[PDB]
Amino acid sequence: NNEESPTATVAEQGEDITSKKDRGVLKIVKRVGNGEETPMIGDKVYVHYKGKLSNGKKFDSSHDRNEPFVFSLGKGQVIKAWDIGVATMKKGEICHLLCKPEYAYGSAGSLPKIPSNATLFFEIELLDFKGE
Amino acid sequence: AMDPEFMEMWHEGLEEASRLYFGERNVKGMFEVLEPLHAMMERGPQTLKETSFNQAYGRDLMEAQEWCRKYMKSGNVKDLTQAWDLYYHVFRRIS
Ligand SMILES: CO[C@H]1C[C@@H]2CC[C@@H](C)[C@@](O)(O2)C(=O)C(=O)N2CCCC[C@H]2C(=O)O[C@H]([C@H](C)C[C@@H]2CC[C@@H](O)[C@H](OC)C2)CC(=O)[C@H](C)/C=C(\C)[C@@H](O)[C@@H](OC)C(=O)[C@H](C)C[C@H](C)/C=C/C=C/C=C/1C
């Protein structure tokens, strides 16, 4: 009841990591990684994540432990916020991303889980990444 | 070693189904385009290359299909996430 909200924290303190600085994707680092390098365009990336609506309603809980979630970076396989956000991460890093609908699912949403014009919160741990 | 046709059909169908489901919110369309692919795996006389495919991915594809049947009976959307996890895993192995 009187505790920190991770979602409010990224909304009110997160750095804007869009190139335009349009507030579309905001980032807070929870745990600093060890890596020198960040993942590059076309890399295969492995993560744990979970996702919540900005109102607190969870929409993804089952990918945060155990088998990694894999995707190819910078390809439009995933929402724009992740292509921007994950590209800033180092190996071992955990961050929170707050994603405006223009960098997520827009006015169409992805119902039933994602309503139209939804701002999304993710926690992501970058596990590892590969060139090939 | 593994059937080129089965590999190409699942790659194409899984890609279509994902666009129907994630792109168009078309669950019925998703089930329809994958249904004859599952029925292929199940039905009799099989070659050596298709037997090999079925050995590599058949359990996961069967389980993915069962989660879809569960979804139909219950309406539990988590049954679809379970199915897509398995479909994606197979999609990645064959790409
Ligand atoms: C069971 O768990 C689901 C993930 C769920 C779905 C529902 C959403 C709420 C969510 O809960 O994830 C979620 O938290 C979320 O918002 N995600 C997933 C994690 C990355 C960020 C975001 C996302 O972009 O999802 C993605 C979002 C829902 C759809 C895409 C958003 C961007 C847009 O440009 C794409 O247009 C094409 C569509 C889902 C994915 O990350 C998967 C991997 C990618 C796709 C389906 C498409 O790229 C597809 O395009 C043909 C492909 O090329 C893939 C490889 C083809 C194979 C057969 C399909 C694999 C399906 C995997 C599904 C998985 C693991």
PDB file of all heavy atoms in Angstrom, chain B residues 37-56, unseen atoms left out:
ATOM      1  N   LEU B  37      -1.982 -30.253 -41.279  1.00  0.00           N
ATOM      2  CA  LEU B  37      -0.596 -30.580 -40.915  1.00  0.00           C
ATOM      3  C   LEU B  37      -0.527 -31.554 -39.740  1.00  0.00           C
ATOM      4  O   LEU B  37       0.196 -32.539 -39.809  1.00  0.00           O
ATOM      5  CB  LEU B  37       0.224 -29.318 -40.629  1.00  0.00           C
ATOM      6  CG  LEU B  37       0.219 -28.238 -41.712  1.00  0.00           C
ATOM      7  CD1 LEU B  37       1.169 -27.092 -41.387  1.00  0.00           C
ATOM      8  CD2 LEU B  37       0.521 -28.839 -43.095  1.00  0.00           C
ATOM      9  N   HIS B  38      -1.301 -31.311 -38.682  1.00  0.00           N
ATOM     10  CA  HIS B  38      -1.395 -32.283 -37.583  1.00  0.00           C
ATOM     11  C   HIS B  38      -1.944 -33.626 -38.022  1.00  0.00           C
ATOM     12  O   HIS B  38      -1.455 -34.677 -37.588  1.00  0.00           O
ATOM     13  CB  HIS B  38      -2.277 -31.756 -36.461  1.00  0.00           C
ATOM     14  CG  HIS B  38      -1.649 -30.658 -35.663  1.00  0.00           C
ATOM     15  ND1 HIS B  38      -0.594 -30.879 -34.810  1.00  0.00           N
ATOM     16  CD2 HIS B  38      -1.936 -29.336 -35.580  1.00  0.00           C
ATOM     17  CE1 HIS B  38      -0.260 -29.739 -34.225  1.00  0.00           C
ATOM     18  NE2 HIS B  38      -1.066 -28.790 -34.667  1.00  0.00           N
ATOM     19  N   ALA B  39      -2.975 -33.585 -38.870  1.00  0.00           N
ATOM     20  CA  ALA B  39      -3.600 -34.801 -39.405  1.00  0.00           C
ATOM     21  C   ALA B  39      -2.661 -35.628 -40.291  1.00  0.00           C
ATOM     22  O   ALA B  39      -2.756 -36.846 -40.285  1.00  0.00           O
ATOM     23  CB  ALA B  39      -4.900 -34.472 -40.129  1.00  0.00           C
ATOM     24  N   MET B  40      -1.771 -34.971 -41.027  1.00  0.00           N
ATOM     25  CA  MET B  40      -0.656 -35.619 -41.734  1.00  0.00           C
ATOM     26  C   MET B  40       0.209 -36.514 -40.847  1.00  0.00           C
ATOM     27  O   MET B  40       0.517 -37.647 -41.210  1.00  0.00           O
ATOM     28  CB  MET B  40       0.290 -34.547 -42.214  1.00  0.00           C
ATOM     29  CG  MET B  40       0.434 -34.357 -43.669  1.00  0.00           C
ATOM     30  SD  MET B  40       1.458 -32.872 -43.848  1.00  0.00           S
ATOM     31  CE  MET B  40       2.428 -32.796 -42.365  1.00  0.00           C
ATOM     32  N   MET B  41       0.647 -35.947 -39.718  1.00  0.00           N
ATOM     33  CA  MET B  41       1.562 -36.573 -38.761  1.00  0.00           C
ATOM     34  C   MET B  41       0.947 -37.821 -38.174  1.00  0.00           C
ATOM     35  O   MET B  41       1.645 -38.770 -37.845  1.00  0.00           O
ATOM     36  CB  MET B  41       1.838 -35.619 -37.588  1.00  0.00           C
ATOM     37  CG  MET B  41       2.278 -34.206 -37.955  1.00  0.00           C
ATOM     38  SD  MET B  41       3.907 -34.111 -38.695  1.00  0.00           S
ATOM     39  CE  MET B  41       4.911 -34.471 -37.241  1.00  0.00           C
ATOM     40  N   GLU B  42      -0.376 -37.789 -38.038  1.00  0.00           N
ATOM     41  CA  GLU B  42      -1.136 -38.813 -37.345  1.00  0.00           C
ATOM     42  C   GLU B  42      -1.448 -39.997 -38.245  1.00  0.00           C
ATOM     43  O   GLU B  42      -1.427 -41.134 -37.793  1.00  0.00           O
ATOM     44  CB  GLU B  42      -2.436 -38.213 -36.783  1.00  0.00           C
ATOM     45  N   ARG B  43      -1.713 -39.721 -39.519  1.00  0.00           N
ATOM     46  CA  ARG B  43      -2.233 -40.719 -40.450  1.00  0.00           C
ATOM     47  C   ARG B  43      -1.158 -41.672 -40.979  1.00  0.00           C
ATOM     48  O   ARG B  43       0.018 -41.313 -41.077  1.00  0.00           O
ATOM     49  CB  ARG B  43      -2.974 -40.037 -41.604  1.00  0.00           C
ATOM     50  N   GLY B  44      -1.605 -42.883 -41.324  1.00  0.00           N
ATOM     51  CA  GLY B  44      -0.765 -44.014 -41.743  1.00  0.00           C
ATOM     52  C   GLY B  44       0.340 -43.787 -42.769  1.00  0.00           C
ATOM     53  O   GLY B  44       0.891 -42.684 -42.848  1.00  0.00           O
ATOM     54  N   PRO B  45       0.646 -44.822 -43.579  1.00  0.00           N
ATOM     55  CA  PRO B  45       1.910 -45.004 -44.301  1.00  0.00           C
ATOM     56  C   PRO B  45       2.797 -43.757 -44.437  1.00  0.00           C
ATOM     57  O   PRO B  45       2.390 -42.754 -45.030  1.00  0.00           O
ATOM     58  CB  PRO B  45       1.444 -45.540 -45.656  1.00  0.00           C
ATOM     59  CG  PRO B  45       0.204 -46.371 -45.299  1.00  0.00           C
ATOM     60  CD  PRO B  45      -0.295 -45.906 -43.920  1.00  0.00           C
ATOM     61  N   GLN B  46       4.003 -43.846 -43.882  1.00  0.00           N
ATOM     62  CA  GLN B  46       4.949 -42.736 -43.836  1.00  0.00           C
ATOM     63  C   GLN B  46       6.289 -43.184 -44.412  1.00  0.00           C
ATOM     64  O   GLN B  46       6.689 -44.344 -44.224  1.00  0.00           O
ATOM     65  CB  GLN B  46       5.141 -42.311 -42.386  1.00  0.00           C
ATOM     66  CG  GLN B  46       4.992 -40.825 -42.132  1.00  0.00           C
ATOM     67  CD  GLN B  46       4.113 -40.538 -40.931  1.00  0.00           C
ATOM     68  OE1 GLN B  46       4.450 -39.713 -40.076  1.00  0.00           O
ATOM     69  NE2 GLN B  46       2.969 -41.223 -40.860  1.00  0.00           N
ATOM     70  N   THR B  47       6.984 -42.283 -45.114  1.00  0.00           N
ATOM     71  CA  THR B  47       8.320 -42.606 -45.643  1.00  0.00           C
ATOM     72  C   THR B  47       9.355 -42.530 -44.524  1.00  0.00           C
ATOM     73  O   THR B  47       9.015 -42.232 -43.387  1.00  0.00           O
ATOM     74  CB  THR B  47       8.758 -41.683 -46.816  1.00  0.00           C
ATOM     75  OG1 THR B  47       9.030 -40.364 -46.321  1.00  0.00           O
ATOM     76  CG2 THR B  47       7.696 -41.630 -47.914  1.00  0.00           C
ATOM     77  N   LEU B  48      10.611 -42.810 -44.854  1.00  0.00           N
ATOM     78  CA  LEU B  48      11.719 -42.721 -43.906  1.00  0.00           C
ATOM     79  C   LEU B  48      12.021 -41.274 -43.480  1.00  0.00           C
ATOM     80  O   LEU B  48      12.292 -40.999 -42.300  1.00  0.00           O
ATOM     81  CB  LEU B  48      12.956 -43.367 -44.522  1.00  0.00           C
ATOM     82  CG  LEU B  48      14.053 -43.964 -43.655  1.00  0.00           C
ATOM     83  CD1 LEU B  48      13.489 -44.806 -42.519  1.00  0.00           C
ATOM     84  CD2 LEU B  48      14.976 -44.791 -44.540  1.00  0.00           C
ATOM     85  N   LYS B  49      11.961 -40.351 -44.436  1.00  0.00           N
ATOM     86  CA  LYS B  49      12.238 -38.946 -44.153  1.00  0.00           C
ATOM     87  C   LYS B  49      11.129 -38.299 -43.313  1.00  0.00           C
ATOM     88  O   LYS B  49      11.408 -37.479 -42.442  1.00  0.00           O
ATOM     89  CB  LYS B  49      12.472 -38.160 -45.447  1.00  0.00           C
ATOM     90  CG  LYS B  49      13.778 -38.504 -46.168  1.00  0.00           C
ATOM     91  CD  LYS B  49      14.123 -37.422 -47.190  1.00  0.00           C
ATOM     92  CE  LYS B  49      15.404 -37.753 -47.929  1.00  0.00           C
ATOM     93  NZ  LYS B  49      15.139 -38.594 -49.138  1.00  0.00           N
ATOM     94  N   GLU B  50       9.878 -38.673 -43.568  1.00  0.00           N
ATOM     95  CA  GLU B  50       8.782 -38.149 -42.773  1.00  0.00           C
ATOM     96  C   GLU B  50       8.658 -38.825 -41.396  1.00  0.00           C
ATOM     97  O   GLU B  50       8.212 -38.203 -40.440  1.00  0.00           O
ATOM     98  CB  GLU B  50       7.454 -38.055 -43.558  1.00  0.00           C
ATOM     99  CG  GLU B  50       7.114 -39.163 -44.485  1.00  0.00           C
ATOM    100  CD  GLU B  50       5.922 -38.864 -45.399  1.00  0.00           C
ATOM    101  OE1 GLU B  50       5.993 -37.959 -46.277  1.00  0.00           O
ATOM    102  OE2 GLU B  50       4.905 -39.572 -45.257  1.00  0.00           O
ATOM    103  N   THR B  51       9.102 -40.077 -41.292  1.00  0.00           N
ATOM    104  CA  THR B  51       9.172 -40.776 -40.005  1.00  0.00           C
ATOM    105  C   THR B  51      10.185 -40.082 -39.086  1.00  0.00           C
ATOM    106  O   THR B  51       9.978 -39.984 -37.882  1.00  0.00           O
ATOM    107  CB  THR B  51       9.509 -42.290 -40.188  1.00  0.00           C
ATOM    108  OG1 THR B  51       8.387 -42.939 -40.792  1.00  0.00           O
ATOM    109  CG2 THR B  51       9.784 -42.974 -38.860  1.00  0.00           C
ATOM    110  N   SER B  52      11.250 -39.579 -39.707  1.00  0.00           N
ATOM    111  CA  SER B  52      12.364 -38.936 -39.040  1.00  0.00           C
ATOM    112  C   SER B  52      11.953 -37.563 -38.519  1.00  0.00           C
ATOM    113  O   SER B  52      12.315 -37.186 -37.399  1.00  0.00           O
ATOM    114  CB  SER B  52      13.520 -38.796 -40.033  1.00  0.00           C
ATOM    115  OG  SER B  52      14.661 -38.239 -39.417  1.00  0.00           O
ATOM    116  N   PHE B  53      11.208 -36.821 -39.342  1.00  0.00           N
ATOM    117  CA  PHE B  53      10.599 -35.565 -38.939  1.00  0.00           C
ATOM    118  C   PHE B  53       9.676 -35.773 -37.739  1.00  0.00           C
ATOM    119  O   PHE B  53       9.753 -35.023 -36.781  1.00  0.00           O
ATOM    120  CB  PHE B  53       9.814 -34.943 -40.105  1.00  0.00           C
ATOM    121  CG  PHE B  53       9.268 -33.574 -39.801  1.00  0.00           C
ATOM    122  CD1 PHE B  53       9.963 -32.433 -40.187  1.00  0.00           C
ATOM    123  CD2 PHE B  53       8.057 -33.424 -39.126  1.00  0.00           C
ATOM    124  CE1 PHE B  53       9.464 -31.181 -39.897  1.00  0.00           C
ATOM    125  CE2 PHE B  53       7.553 -32.185 -38.840  1.00  0.00           C
ATOM    126  CZ  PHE B  53       8.259 -31.056 -39.230  1.00  0.00           C
ATOM    127  N   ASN B  54       8.817 -36.791 -37.813  1.00  0.00           N
ATOM    128  CA  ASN B  54       7.833 -37.118 -36.780  1.00  0.00           C
ATOM    129  C   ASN B  54       8.492 -37.564 -35.476  1.00  0.00           C
ATOM    130  O   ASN B  54       7.929 -37.399 -34.390  1.00  0.00           O
ATOM    131  CB  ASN B  54       6.854 -38.192 -37.307  1.00  0.00           C
ATOM    132  CG  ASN B  54       5.714 -38.530 -36.315  1.00  0.00           C
ATOM    133  OD1 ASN B  54       5.047 -37.643 -35.753  1.00  0.00           O
ATOM    134  ND2 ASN B  54       5.482 -39.818 -36.116  1.00  0.00           N
ATOM    135  N   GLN B  55       9.683 -38.143 -35.594  1.00  0.00           N
ATOM    136  CA  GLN B  55      10.457 -38.541 -34.435  1.00  0.00           C
ATOM    137  C   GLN B  55      11.056 -37.307 -33.777  1.00  0.00           C
ATOM    138  O   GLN B  55      11.086 -37.205 -32.549  1.00  0.00           O
ATOM    139  CB  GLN B  55      11.550 -39.544 -34.822  1.00  0.00           C
ATOM    140  CG  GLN B  55      12.003 -40.448 -33.676  1.00  0.00           C
ATOM    141  CD  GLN B  55      10.944 -41.462 -33.286  1.00  0.00           C
ATOM    142  OE1 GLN B  55      10.732 -41.750 -32.080  1.00  0.00           O
ATOM    143  NE2 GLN B  55      10.267 -42.009 -34.301  1.00  0.00           N
ATOM    144  N   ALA B  56      11.520 -36.368 -34.598  1.00  0.00           N
ATOM    145  CA  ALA B  56      12.143 -35.142 -34.096  1.00  0.00           C
ATOM    146  C   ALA B  56      11.144 -34.154 -33.475  1.00  0.00           C
ATOM    147  O   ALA B  56      11.403 -33.636 -32.382  1.00  0.00           O
ATOM    148  CB  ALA B  56      12.980 -34.465 -35.167  1.00  0.00           C
TER     149      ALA B  56
END
